[PDB]
Ligand binder design. Sequence first.
Ligand code: QDW
Length: 864
Amino acid sequence: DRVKKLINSQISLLIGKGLHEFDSLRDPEVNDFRTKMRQFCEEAAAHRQQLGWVEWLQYSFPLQLEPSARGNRALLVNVKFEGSEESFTFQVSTKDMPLALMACALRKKATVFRQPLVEQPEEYALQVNGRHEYLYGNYPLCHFQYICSCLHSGLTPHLTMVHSSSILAMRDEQSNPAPSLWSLEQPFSIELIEGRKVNADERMKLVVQAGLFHGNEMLCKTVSSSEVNVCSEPVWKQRLEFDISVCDLPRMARLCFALYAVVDCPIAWANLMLFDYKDQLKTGERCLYMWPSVLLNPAGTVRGNPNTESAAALVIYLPEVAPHPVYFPALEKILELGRHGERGRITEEEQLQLREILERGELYEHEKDLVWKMRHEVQEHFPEALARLLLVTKWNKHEDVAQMLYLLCSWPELPVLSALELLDFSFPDCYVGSFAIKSLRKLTDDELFQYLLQLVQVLKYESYLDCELTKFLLGRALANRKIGHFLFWHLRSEMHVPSVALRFGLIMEAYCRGSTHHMKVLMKQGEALSKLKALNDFVKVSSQKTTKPQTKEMMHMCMRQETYMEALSHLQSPLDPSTLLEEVCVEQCTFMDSKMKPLWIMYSSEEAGSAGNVGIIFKNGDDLRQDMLTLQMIQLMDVLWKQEGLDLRMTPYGCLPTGDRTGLIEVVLHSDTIANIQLNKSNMAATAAFNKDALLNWLKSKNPGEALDRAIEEFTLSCAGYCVATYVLGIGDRHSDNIMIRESGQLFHIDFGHFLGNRERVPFILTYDFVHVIQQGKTNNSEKFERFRGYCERAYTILRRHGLLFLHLFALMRAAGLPELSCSKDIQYLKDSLALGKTEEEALKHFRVKFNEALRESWKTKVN
Ligand SMILES: COc1ncc2cc1NS(=O)(=O)CCN(C)Cc1ccc3c(c1)N2CCO3
């Protein structure tokens, strides 16, 4: 008590939902989750508080390595010892490991301080100055992202020697405070009693459409009520009998409802699991608080609408199918039934038919019959074809499900790629999901981080609160502070969505039990975001009444207040926990002229020097979820290309929704839009004789002498990357104001509100302004242009080879409820852009035709 009461009030404020609201529900599923997950997260907390000092560096500052390093050249480094003004600058090689650098700094200190030190290089770690980032382990310096960045930008790495006792003092201070169905052969049936708080046109009639689903797949035909006159409280009091026995209902069977008005006018929909969280087949009266429709929705949540006051409610009755409670058979009873079967002793000709269709993904009924018959052969010689076999399994026949389950329980572990496919709502079985998680345990923290966003969306397909995916995500989050950081923010940003608020709020509470210190760290971030919202509202009001210089001076005065200076300063960035947002640079803060007046907040850090000069963009009113997905997809391409030794110098900057139409974007400094550069302002070092000269002149002024060639090369590489990225993703609405260029020459895209050709197929784009720079400012430079076409081809063929990874990830994102990622049609776009139904030669020929057709469109600007 007292500390417990304080933690409870801090979790409530952090998650944006009072913990008392969980207790008011009086829900045993909610109560069992809270107790079990608190227990699981506190065990993780205790494991962590006793980690070795290097293990605790791995928890708190996971290594940031180059994609080529996962799984020569001279370098100048600056090293100081913790809390010392004195630093040493020395020459090392990119091939040297941190230990060699540390042993060298220790020899330098020993000679300066005139004593042979007690300390060995094994006792230290190198912190990147003013950053929550460390260099450690047996990796050459070039394999670290920080060193790599310093090399490309020519800057000097600045490192601090941190002794193991100082790391241990970090661990210690951050501590959690001290403490039988199968005999029921009758057809499935329900009583549709009545409707409540129903709003519809009195000239029409009300109908309830009802279906039995196992994921998206129907277990039998849909059934409908009789038409009853429209009113607030319609009364059906009728029996709805489905064509499927009670014994054949799979574990993950859901009963789906849709209420509508007819002369079709959709009103509401509601779903429920037929078995509870404790495997008991549901009986008795159920009051279903319906969700308003935008006709059956099986992917929809199986929990009632919390707004009980305004929601239309359907009252149903689940009949007593037995005198005693009926539970779903345990795994031992399932195995014993499915263990008995017949193996596919079939001809060598039909074996060639099977091999063909398993390596080939829709298939004709006779092929489904053959796949099912040859299921033993599928397990033994094609284990990666599990997803195809699971789709041919008859989920409405309990004996077929037992036979599938028996094979799954002895199925070998699958690659991460195959596992991600199995998390799709198309594989709704709980043992399948459990198996998918089992095959994902081998994900590295870097891979997990790359797919975290999609795994969090998968939580919306879960039928129960306590699931293997929640346990997996919590355990990985409590084992890695960066995973924990982003898991929190992905959950927090959806607390305003009623369908997920309970599930997401419960996961965040469990996590907080696991890391009291991190809760306080995220509270610091939440307080800055609260002040940014109040600051932005002020700007939106102030900007409609006065001029921008007046609103800017006001925003500054508001920021200069004690409460603002305190809340806005000294925090870890929500976009990147490695980034410390130290002193807010009020004078450099401003806002944009657009409708929502986004804020531009600048920071500085004495300790980080030039690297501490960072900015964040705060947006309130705009929805940044699609931008975040596109930027994560661009970053994925960048990793995939770097794994083949192809660095296209991309700028996948941070973008993170943090709340309801609220989020942050990472400022990329030393950059300007193509439109600003092309405005061709007079009395500037870039003023052009021809508007086409503007970008190159601007590049010339920023990169004098020999630096220009490096800048043209960076432009060319990034240009090839973004031409491929925008084409594959179907990024449209591309204009001079949503294309940026860095002083280094790097081109990058911004504002991804429209993707996947949003509906019209986006053609490959090539601009003459960009062609002019690639060609070093020459009319004819085929050597340079075709070297650019080589980069686009190479980048495109690498992406194609990971085509299925993009497909599986985008299929998982359908759960996000993004207006441009709703159906199969939206993903056909990525299937076409990657030309996945073709050979590498057929696809490359298609890309060439698409690139050439974009070169002719480009020449309509050149001709003038
Ligand atoms: C979806 O919106 C955005 N996406 C990316 C960027 C900015 C915005 N919005 S904005 O701040 O209103 C436009 C700022 N404009 C000066 C151009 C600019 C400059 C630097 C940027 C940037 C936009 N990005 C993120 C990277 O850093």
